[PDB]
Structure formats: structure tokens, C-alpha cells
Amino acid sequence: LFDENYYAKAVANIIGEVKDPIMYKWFSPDQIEDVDLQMGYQKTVKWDAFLNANPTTIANEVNTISTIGFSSEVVRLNYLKLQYKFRHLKQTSEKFYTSDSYIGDINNNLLPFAQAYKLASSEIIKLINHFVLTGTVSIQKDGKNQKRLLPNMYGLLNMPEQIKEEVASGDKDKMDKIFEKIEAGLSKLELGDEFSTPMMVIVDPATSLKLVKPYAAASSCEKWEDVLIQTIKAINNREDVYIETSNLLKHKILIYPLNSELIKFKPSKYMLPTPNEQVDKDSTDVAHSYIDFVLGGLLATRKTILQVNIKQS
Amino acid sequence: ASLLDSNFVPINFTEFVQAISNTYKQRRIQFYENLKRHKR
Amino acid sequence: VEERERIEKQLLLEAERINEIDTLAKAHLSNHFNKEVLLAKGYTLKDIMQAQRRELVRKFVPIEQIKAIAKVSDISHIDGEILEQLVSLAKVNIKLR
Amino acid sequence: MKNPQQDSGLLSNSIDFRDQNLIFSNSGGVCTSSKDKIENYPAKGYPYKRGVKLSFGDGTTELEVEAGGGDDLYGVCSDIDEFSGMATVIPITNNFTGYLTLKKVNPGDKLNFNQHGELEKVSVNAIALSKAHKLTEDLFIVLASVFGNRA
């Protein structure tokens, strides 16, 4: 294959230089499982029981007894397939563009296939990491003109039926007020029997700098971060509480456990960027290539994620 | 069945794509093996 | 005990031959004919070695030499000194390749 | 000039991935079909990212393309090579979607080309897909899709 197609050989040589996505830090090894699907859906069933009324007293003779109800719930996960096209230089056209210390037409913005592919992969992987966190796909910094996606496609920030807290504008810089709202959300969390598990906190850099200040006179050898870790340790049965920072977040605090039972990530085995066999060619030196990637596969139980929004002005 | 193995010689594009997926998975496994989170 | 010593000498000789054949076959033919997967599929060691030798002949030795020197186009049943000649010719072919 | 001739003083920060396409150096279309018809013509002036019209000399030299519009519109210039002075032109018969020069506007507005190859609000030729983006004091670009000529 490599003898027939140079582009396949080039990708195999250049694939090792692409950095791993940063979302891997957001999940435990067991929380991620690969599914063999490109486009479509995957469904699962959950069974629940409930009590309809107060228990019935067994005295003398009685026929009317209280009932215990049952219900089924079907959970569907959606997977979508998306593609980009990028131009580059023909393989048998590089010698007429190799400069002293670089290859490519600077004036016309043309690159060799290897460098073009590597840059394209990095940009897509950034886009994937954005979707996994924020649940949306958009190229504007305002998060508008979003790509209309299928239902049952959610990220860690747009997941419905979760605990949401809002710090008012007047308390944007008051760390005590922010920590107050965190506790209210922590109380409303419903981990239940899966309490004994590691927890994960993802915070924006602006709030992270607020955390490192000493806890408030001021308590020496005690920071706001240390107080928060202990507070989370209260409900997770004294388990590890990791904190990470992401520039993607903006005035947002995200707390969720690292238990596969509550939150599960089942991405496609072809989620990460992959070359396409179709290569446009012409008489000129400019060729086109295609990269494919798959989105979707995030499943989580309701009322297990805390989302804190610090309303800025 | 991964790009890491130098002895691996793909026969067609389909096998090449499968090796990429296997290679991505192995890197993820290796990443988590070598990951050392900050506990404080 | 020298009879067993010579038996062990022959064992080492055939083991070295098998190791050389396997090492060259892994880099020449494919990974599908690996010793582990063939054993999983249920072939004896000698059967694995002869199958690898026949594949080596089918890859290096041209079909005309098979149907002229070995007198049969099919290497399915030619095993023996004719197979030794065929694998020697395959070694010559890979040397000149 | 599509490519800023003046050299930059600093290395760019390749960390973000949003709003990194609103530059004048971006050539072609945002969405491009592999079945598009592409022509190159001698360039009269700088018609880059402008509507072009056919202009004939005195017959000694072949025809060339100049920035223009109105009833004389022939195509849209999407790229230009400065060394050869050849302007890449997509015919008005073919449809184009990309960033084009705007006269110095909301999505959904119908736009027509003026005498200088600049898009302006209202025959219609294209429809605005976004709002005006300011690159220089007088340079305004807009994402528009052209679908030919229709009254």
C-alpha cells in the first residue's frame, strides 16, 4: 500500500508527532470505552420501581392493597460523522518549491502534505475537545452560528437535569459568595451509593487564581483550595479530589465524579481524525485531501454534575 | 495491528485505517498508564 | 549418553533452521502466518514449518521452476528433498532480490 | 495586497482555534466543490476579492479582467498570483460562497455588485451570510454566497 500511495506513507510517519487530546485528563481510564460505529445510534434500557401509596395495614379482611409501580427508560446516544477538506502541494511538485530552509509557497500559502496534515489534525482535535466540554460546535468566539446537531448529543456543560448555580454580579469577586454557592450545589448532589469515588473539578483560570489565596483575618496554612477539597472530601468518602484548569471555560465551575457507573464516555473508535482515501488531483500542483472525525457518545446520570456560573456584570 | 510496529505492512487503505484506530487506542492506554495526577 | 548428545545436536540444528525460517518469513510474507496464530488455529510445529516453506516457495520461486524442477505446479504435495531444493532456490532468489 | 508585505515583529500564538479566518490573506471559498470551474486571466489592477468584468484593449493584447460589476459582471476573483499577475476567476454561471469585499448590513440582505467590484445593499446576485467585518479603515469584508443573476 505504501508503495502505491505516498500519502498513506506520509501520514504514518507524521502521525506520531500529533499531541494527545487534553480531554483524557478529564476522565478515568475505565470511564472511556470504544464503540465500533461511524454514524448512527446506540440504545440501552434501564428499569426503575416506585411506591404508589402508603403501605396497607393487614388487619381483619381486606382486598384493596396499595401497589408498587414500575417504569422503563430507554437511553439513546447519537453519533455524527463530519469532514474537512484541505489543499496542499502535489507530491511530485516539492522540488520546485524547496527553499533554503523551508518547503512551500509563502506568497500563496501552500504547504507539503505532511505539514498540512499535521496542522489540520491539531485544529480538529482542538474542536473535538471544545465539544466534549461545552457540548457545542462553533468557530466564532461568541459561540454563535453553531452547527445544528442531533439530539442525544451532549457535553459536560450542556447536559440537562443537573444542578446549576449562579453567582450574582455584585459577588463576582467575593470568594466567600462563590464558595457559598458551591456548597449549595454540593448539598443538592445525589451521588447516593456511588459516593465513594474520586471527584474531578474543572475551573477557569480567573477563578483558579481566586482559589489559591489563603482562606478567610486570614487562616495561615489554609487556602480556599484546601477548604474546597475538604468539603468535597466530606461527601466522596475521603477520596481523591483533583482540580484542573481549562482556558475553554469562562467563569464556569464544573464538578463531577470519576465513576464509570454514573458518567460513562463511549466515543467511536473513529472519533479522532483519520485520512480519507479520496485525493483530488489536477494538472496543476495543488491537490486536496479530506479528514474524517466522529462526535458523540457521552452518557451521564441526572443530578450528578454541578455547574456554577459566575455572572460577570 | 498498530502503526507502532515497524514490521506491520498494511495491504490496503482499510487495514491502514484500522491500524490508526489501534494506534490511537494504544496511545490513550499508555497515556493513562504514565499519567500522574496532583493529589494536593 | 553420547547418542542423546548427538540427538540434542540435531535438535539444535533443526531449531536454528526453524528460527531462521520464521525470522525471514515474518519479514517477507505476512503476520497472518505467525507461529502463535497458526498454533491457535491448530497446526503442529512441523506442519507450520512446511506451510511456511511452501509459502516462501510460492513467493520467491517462479511457477515455471515449480512445474519443471518439481514436476508439479502445486506445492501442496511435493514435500521432501524437492521441497529442500525449492527453498534453496527461494533463498537464492531473495539473496538476488 | 493579499499577503501583508510588511514582516511581523512577533511570533503568533497558535493556541486558540476560533475567529482565525477573518483575514484578508484567506483565498478561495469557505466551502469548495471539487467540480468547480476555475479560470485565470491577466489582471488589470488589483481585483482580488472583487467582482470582475472582461475588458478588451485595442486588439494588440488579449483580453483581461478588471474590478467591476453592474451588467458587465463576468465572475468573482477568489485568488491572485502576484508574480505572474494572473487572477483566478470563478464564472458567474458557477456559484460561489466565501468572503468578499463590501462597500463601506445584516444576514439575509440581498447584495449586488457596484462599479468597483464591491458588494452593496439593494437585480440581485448574492445574499449576505453574516455582518460586515472591518479589517482596515476602509477595508470591509463579508461572507456572501453568489448564485448568479436574477431580477
Q: What is the DSSP string of D13-41?
A: -TT--SS---STT--S-SS--TT---EEE
HEC string of chain A equals: CCCCCHHHHHHHHHHHHCCCCHHHHHCCHHHECCECCCCEEEEEEEEEEEECCCCCCCCCCCCCCCCEEEEEEEEEEEEEEEEEEEEEECHHHCCCCECCCCECECCCCECCHHHHHHHHHHHHHHHHHHHHHHCCCCCCCCCCCCCCCCCCCCCCCCCCCCEEEEECHHHCCCHHHHHHHHHHHHHHCCCHHHHCCCEEEEECHHHHHHHCCECCCCCCCCEHHHHHHHHHHHHCCCCCEEEEECCCCCCEEEEEECCCCCEEECCECCCCCEECCCCECCCCCEEEEEEEEEECCEEECCCCCEEEEECCC
CA distance A239 to C67: 73
Secondary element (H or E) of residue D43: strand D39-44
Secondary element (H or E) of residue D44: strand D39-44
Angle, nearest 10°, between helix axes C2-28 and C45-60?
40
Contact residues on chain B for A15, CB-CB shorter than 8 A = 3, 20, 23
Count other Cβ atoms within 10 Å, centred on residue A218. Answer: 9
Distance from CA of D60 to the nearest CA of A (A): 29
Whether B8 sits inside 8 A of C26 (CB atoms) is: no
Grid coordinates standing for D111? 447584495
Residue whose C-alpha cell is 416506585: A50
Which of A19, A87, A106, A109 is the best mutation test for D, with the most CBs of D within 10 A?
A109
CA distance A170 to A295: 39
CA torsion angle D67 D71 D77 D83 (round to 10) = -40
| Residue A160 backbone phi and psi in degrees, to 5 | -80, 175
Count other Cβ atoms within 10 Å, centred on residue A16. Answer: 10
CB pairs under 8 A between A and B: 47
Whether D21 sits inside 8 A of A139 (CB atoms) is: yes
Considering only CA atoms, which of B35, B31, B20 is closest in space to residue A272? B20
Count other Cβ atoms within 10 Å, centred on residue D123. Answer: 12
Distance from CA of C31 to the nearest CA of B (A): 8
**Resolution (in Å) of the shown entry?**
10.6
Whether D19 sits inside 8 A of A140 (CB atoms) is: yes
- Neighboring chains of A (3 or more beta-carbon pairs < 8 A): B, D
Contact residues on chain C for B9, CB-CB shorter than 8 A = 30
Please, are residues A258 and A24 in contact by the beta-carbon 8 Å criterion? no
CA distance D34 to A85: 10
Please calculate the CA angle D113-D116-D119 and round it to the nearest 5 degrees.
30
Grid coordinates standing for D90? 470563478
| Residue C33 backbone phi and psi in degrees, to 5 | -95, 30
Whether C27 sits inside 8 A of B8 (CB atoms) is: no
C63-69 own/partner pairs: CB under 8 Å, 24+ apart: C65/C89
Provide the chain B residues 1-40 that lie in CB contact (below 8 A) with chain A. 3, 9-13, 15-17, 20-21, 23-25, 27-29, 31-32, 35, 37-39
Count other Cβ atoms within 10 Å, centred on residue A59. Answer: 6
Distance from CA of B19 to the nearest CA of C (A): 14
Secondary element (H or E) of residue D143: strand D140-150
CA distance D48 to D67: 8
Grid coordinates standing for D149? 443573476
C-chain residue closest to B9, CA distance: C30
> How was this model experimentally determined?
cryo-EM
Q: Is A221 left (phi over 0), alpha (psi -120 to 50) or beta?
A: left
D-chain residue closest to A123, CA distance: D17
CA distance C70 to C58: 13
Pairing of strands D119-121, D124-128: unpaired
Residue whose C-alpha cell is 521452476: C65
Please, are residues D122 and D107 in contact by the beta-carbon 8 Å criterion? no
Contact residues on chain D for A108, CB-CB shorter than 8 A = 27, 79, 81
HEC string of D67-81 equals: ECCHHHEEEEEEEEE
**Residues followed by a break in chain D, C–N over 2.5 Å?**
104, 122
Single-letter amino acid, residue A270: Y
Please, are residues D12 and D20 in contact by the beta-carbon 8 Å criterion? no
Chain-centroid distance, C-alpha D144: 10
Contact residues on chain C for B7, CB-CB shorter than 8 A = 26-27, 31
SS3 B1: coil
> Which member of B20, B32, B39 has the closest CB to residue A15?
B20
- Neighboring chains of C (3 or more beta-carbon pairs < 8 A): B
Whether A1 sits inside 8 A of B3 (CB atoms) is: no
Grid coordinates standing for B14? 482499510
Contact residues on chain D for A85, CB-CB shorter than 8 A = 32
Rounded to the nearest 5 percent, the helix, strand and coil shares of chain C are 75, 0, 25
Secondary element (H or E) of residue D128: strand D124-128
